[PDB]
Amino acid sequence: LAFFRNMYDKYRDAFLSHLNEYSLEEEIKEHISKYYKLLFDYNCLGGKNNRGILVILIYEYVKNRDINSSEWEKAACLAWCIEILQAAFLVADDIMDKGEMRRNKYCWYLLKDVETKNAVNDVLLLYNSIYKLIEIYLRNESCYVDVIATFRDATLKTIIGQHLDTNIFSDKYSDAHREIDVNNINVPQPVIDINMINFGVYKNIVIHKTAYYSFFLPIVCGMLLAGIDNLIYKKIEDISMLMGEYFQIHDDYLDIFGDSTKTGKVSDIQNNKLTWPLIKTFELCSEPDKIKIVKNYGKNNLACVKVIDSLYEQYKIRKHYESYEKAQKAKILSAINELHHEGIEYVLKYLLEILFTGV
Amino acid sequence: AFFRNMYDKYRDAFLSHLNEYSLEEEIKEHISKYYKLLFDYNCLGGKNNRGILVILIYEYVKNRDINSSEWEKAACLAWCIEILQAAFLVADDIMDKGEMRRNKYCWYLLKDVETKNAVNDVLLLYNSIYKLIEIYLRNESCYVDVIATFRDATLKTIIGQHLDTNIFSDKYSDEIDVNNINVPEQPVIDINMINFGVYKNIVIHKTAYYSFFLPIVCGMLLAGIAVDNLIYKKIEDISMLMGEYFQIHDDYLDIFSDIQNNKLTWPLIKTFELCSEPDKIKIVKNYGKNNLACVKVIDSLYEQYKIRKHYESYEKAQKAKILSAINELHHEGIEYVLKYLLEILFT
Numbered sequence: 193l194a195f196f197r198n199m200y201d202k203y204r205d206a207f208l209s210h211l212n213e214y215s216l217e218e219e220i221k222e223h224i225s226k227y228y229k230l231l232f233d234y235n236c237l238g239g240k241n242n243r244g245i246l247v248i249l250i251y252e253y254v255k256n257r258d259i260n261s262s263e264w265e266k267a268a269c270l271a272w273c274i275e276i277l278q279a280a281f282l283v284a285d286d287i288m289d290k291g292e293m294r295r296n297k298y299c300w301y302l303l304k305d306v307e308t309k310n311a312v313n314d315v316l317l318l319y320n321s322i323y324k325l326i327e328i329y330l331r332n333e334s335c336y337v338d339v340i341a342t343f344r345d346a347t348l349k350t351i352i353g354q355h356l357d358t359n360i361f362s363d364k365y366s367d368a369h370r371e372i373d374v375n376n377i378n379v380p381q382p383v384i385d386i387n388m389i390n391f392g393v394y395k396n397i398v399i400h401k402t403a404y405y406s407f408f409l410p411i412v413c414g415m416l417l418a419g420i421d422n423l424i425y426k427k428i429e430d431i432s433m434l435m436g437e438y439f440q441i442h443d444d445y446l447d448i449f450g451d452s453t454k455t456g457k458v459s460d461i462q463n464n465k466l467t468w469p470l471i472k473t474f475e476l477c478s479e480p481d482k483i484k485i486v487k488n489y490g491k492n493n494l495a496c497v498k499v500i501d502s503l504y505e506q507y508k509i510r511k512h513y514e515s516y517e518k519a520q521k522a523k524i525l526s527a528i529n530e531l532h533h534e535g536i537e538y539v540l541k542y543l544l545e546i547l548f549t550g551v
Numbered sequence: 552a553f554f555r556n557m558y559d560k561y562r563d564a565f566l567s568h569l570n571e572y573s574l575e576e577e578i579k580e581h582i583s584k585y586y587k588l589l590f591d592y593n594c595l596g597g598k599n600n601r602g603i604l605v606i607l608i609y610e611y612v613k614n615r616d617i618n619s620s621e622w623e624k625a626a627c628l629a630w631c632i633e634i635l636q637a638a639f640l641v642a643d644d645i646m647d648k649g650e651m652r653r654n655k656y657c658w659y660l661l662k663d664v665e666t667k668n669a670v671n672d673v674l675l676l677y678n679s680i681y682k683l684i685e686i687y688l689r690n691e692s693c694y695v696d697v698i699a700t701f702r703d704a705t706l707k708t709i710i711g712q713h714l715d716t717n718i719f720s721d722k723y724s725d726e727i728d729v730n731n732i733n734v735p736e737q738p739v740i741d742i743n744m745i746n747f748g749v750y751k752n753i754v755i756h757k758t759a760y761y762s763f764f765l766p767i768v769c770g771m772l773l774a775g776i777a778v779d780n781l782i783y784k785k786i787e788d789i790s791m792l793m794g795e796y797f798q799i800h801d802d803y804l805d806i807f808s809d810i811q812n813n814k815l816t817w818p819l820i821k822t823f824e825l826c827s828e829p830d831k832i833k834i835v836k837n838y839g840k841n842n843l844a845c846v847k848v849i850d851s852l853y854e855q856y857k858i859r860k861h862y863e864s865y866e867k868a869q870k871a872k873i874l875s876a877i878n879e880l881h882h883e884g885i886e887y888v889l890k891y892l893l894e895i896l897f898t
C-alpha cells in the first residue's frame with residue numbers, strides 16, 4: 193500500500209524516459225517532459241487507489257508463496273497501469289460531462305494552459321502509456337498477451353457503458369425508428385424517457401461502465417500474473433458485477449447526498465443521468481410527482497435541481513440507500529463464500545469493507 | 552485492391568463482438584445502429600492511401616502465391632490503419648473545432664453526436680483496431696510485433712499532435728499554472744519556433760509514422776520479413792522523408808483554416824525566411840486571428856512572396872531525395888510500391 197504509492201515515480205519516469213528517446217530538438221524534449229510529468233502527477237495522484245491496491249493484494253493472496261522484488265515490480269506496474277487508466281477515464285469523463293472539480297482540484301481540461309484540445313489528446317497519451325509500461329515490464333512474461341487483452345476488453349466494456357450512460361435518454365434511443373440525421377448540426381433540450389427508468393437498464397449501464405475496469409480487470413491482473421483459464425474467473429466475473437453495482441449506487445448517493453469538500457467533486461440531476469435515486473423515487477412516487485420529475489430533471493437551472501433534491505428528501509431516498517447497502521453488502525459476501533479460495537475471499541471481504549474510504 | 556469489398560466483414564466482425572455483451576436486446580439494437588454509422592461515416596470516403604499501401608507492400612514482398620485467408624489478414628491490417636485514420640480525423644476535428652471533413656460535416660458537430668460522444672467514439676474506434684488484430688492475427692507469429700507497431704506509431708502521432716497544438720503556446724515560450732482556469736491565453740506566433748528544424752520534428756511525429764512507417768512495416772511483418780532486418784531502418788528514414796513531403800503539400804493545399812488556427816506551416820516558415828523586417832511584424836500582427844481582414848493580409852503575403860512557386864521548387868527537390876533513398880533499398884518489390892505511392896500520393 194505505502195510500497196505501491198512509492199513505486200509511482202519509477203513507472204512515471206520509465207514512460208517519460210521512452211518519450212525522451214524520440215528524435216526531437218533538446219529544447220522541445222524539455223517542454224514535453226515538463227508537460228507530461230504534470231499530466232501524470234496531476235491526474236494519477238490523489239485517489240483512493242482501490243483498483244491499484246486490489247491488484248497488489250490479489251497478487252499476494254492468490255497463493256501463499258515467495259515473491260521476489262522483480263516479481264513485485266511487475267505487479268506494481270499493472271497496479272499503476274489501472275490508476276493511469278482511471279486517470280484517463282477521469283479526464284475524459286470531465287470533458288464529456290463538463291466537470292468543474294475532481295479530487296478537490298480543478299478538472300485538467302479547465303486549465304487555460306491545457307483546454308479541451310490538449311485534454312482530448314492527453315486521454316489518449318495516458319491510455320497508450322499503459323501498454324508501453326506493460327511492454328517495458330512484462331514483455332517476456334507468458335501472461336503478457338492475456339494481460340494486454342484484459343485491459344483492451346475492460347476498456348471496450350467501459351466505452352460501451354459510457355455510451356449508454358450518455359445516450360440512454362437521447363432522441364436516437366427514444367426515436368429508434370428514425371435514423372441519425374447526418375445533415376443536422378443544430379444544438380439538440382434533454383428530457384427523461386420513462387421506458388428507460390428501470391433497474392434492468394441501470395445494471396446494464398453500471399456493470400459495463402464500472403464493474404469491469406474497477407473490479408474484474410484488477411482481480412484478473414493479479415491472478416494472470418500469479419499464474420492461473422479456470423472456472424474461478426467466471427465466479428470472480430459475477431462478484432465483480434455485484435461489486436460494480438454496489439460501488440456505483442453509492443457514487444450516485446454521494447452525488448446528491450455528499451459534501452464536495454469530502455468527495456473532491458461538485459451534477460447527475462443537471463446532466464440528465466439515469467441514477468439509482470431517480471429510479472427509486474420513480475417507483476415510489478405518485479403520478480403528479482412523476483410529471484414533476486419529467487418537467488424538472490435534466491435542467492441546469494438551480495430551481496429545477498432543488499425540486500428534484502426536495503423530492504429526494506420527501507421520499508427519504510437516503511434511508512432507501514441504507515437499506516439497499518445492507519441488502520447488497522450481504523448478497524456479495526454470500527457469492528464470495530461460494531468461491532472456495534480462502535486467499536481471494538480474504539482480499540474481497542477486506543476490499544468490500546474499505547471500498548468507500550480506501551486504504 | 553478488393554480491399555473496398557472487405558470493409559463490411561471487418562466492420563461486422565467488430566460489431567458482432569459488442570453484440571455478444573450481456574445487454575437487453577433493445578439496447579443491443581441501439582448500439583449496433585449507432586456504431587455502424589460511426590464506422591461508416593468516418594471510415595469511408597478517404598483516398599485510402601494508407602490502407603492500399605499495406606495491400607501493395609504485402610503483394611510485392613511475398614512475390615509468390617497469396618491465398619484468400621492470407622489476404623483476409625492483410626486487408627484487416629489495411630482497414631485497421633483506416634480506422635486509425637478515422638479516429639485521428641474525429642479527434643483532430645474536435646481539437647481544431649473543424650467544420651467539414653471529406654465534404655461532409657465533422658462527426659462531432661452532428662446534433663445526435665456532439666463533442667461528448669465524439670470523444671468517447673475516438674477511443675472506441677481506436678480500441679476496435681486491436682480487437683480486429685486479435686480476431687484475425689492472434690495465431691500469427693508477427694501478432695505481438697504488429698500490435699507494438701500500431702501502439703508505437705500512435706504514441707509518436709500523439710506527441711506530434713501535442714507539438715502542433717502547443718508550439719506557439721505561452722507554456723513553450725520560456726511553469727504551467729494549475730490555478731488559472733479563467734484567463735484564456737490569446738493565440739500568438741513565437742518567431743523562435745518559426746524554423747524548418749522544429750517543423751520537421753512536428754511533421755515527422757504527427758504524419759510520417761502512422762501514414763508511411765506503420766502501413767509499410769505492417770505489410771513487411773505479415774509477409775515474414777524479420778524485425779532484425781536492416782531494411783526496417785531504411786524504410787524508417789524513407790517514411791520520415793515521405794511524411795515531410797506529404798505534410799508540406801497538405802499545408803500548400805490549405806491555402807492554395809491553418810492561418811486562423813495559428814498553425815506552424817511550411818508557407819509561414821518559407822514566407823518568414825524570405826520576407827523583409829516590416830513584413831515580419833505584419834505576419835506577427837495578422838497570423839492566428841479569426842478576422843477576415845487578418846487572414847486576407849497573410850494570404851496576400853503568400854501571393855507576394857510567390858509561395859506556390861517555392862513549393863513547386865521544394866516538391867521537385869524532395870521527390871528526387873526520396874527516389875535516391877528508395878534506390879538504396881535493394882528490394883525491387885518495395886521500391887516499385889514506394890515509387891508508385893509517391894506518384895499517386897496527392898490523388
Ligand SMILES: CC(C)=CCC/C(C)=C/CC/C(C)=C/CCC(C)=CCOP(=O)(O)OP(=O)(O)O
Nearest residue numbers: 313316597598599638639640642643708709712
Ligand atoms: C490517438 C488518437 C486516436 C488520438 C487523439 C489525437 C491525435 C493524436 C490526433 C490526430 C492528429 C492527426 C494525425 C490528424 C489529422 C490528419 C488527417 C485526418 C488527415 C489527412 O490525411 P489524408 O490522407 O490527406 O486524408 P484522407 O484519409 O481523407 O485520404
Ligand SMILES: CC(C)=CCCC(C)=CCC/C(C)=C/CC/C(C)=C/COP(=O)(O)OP(=O)(O)O
Nearest residue numbers: 239240241280281282284285350351354401674
Ligand atoms: C478509453 C478512455 C480513456 C475513454 C473515454 C471515455 C470513458 C470510457 C470513460 C470514462 C467514464 C468513467 C468510467 C468514469 C469515471 C469514474 C470516476 C473518475 C470515478 C470514480 O471512481 P473513484 O474510485 O470514486 O475515484 P478515485 O480513483 O479518486 O478513488
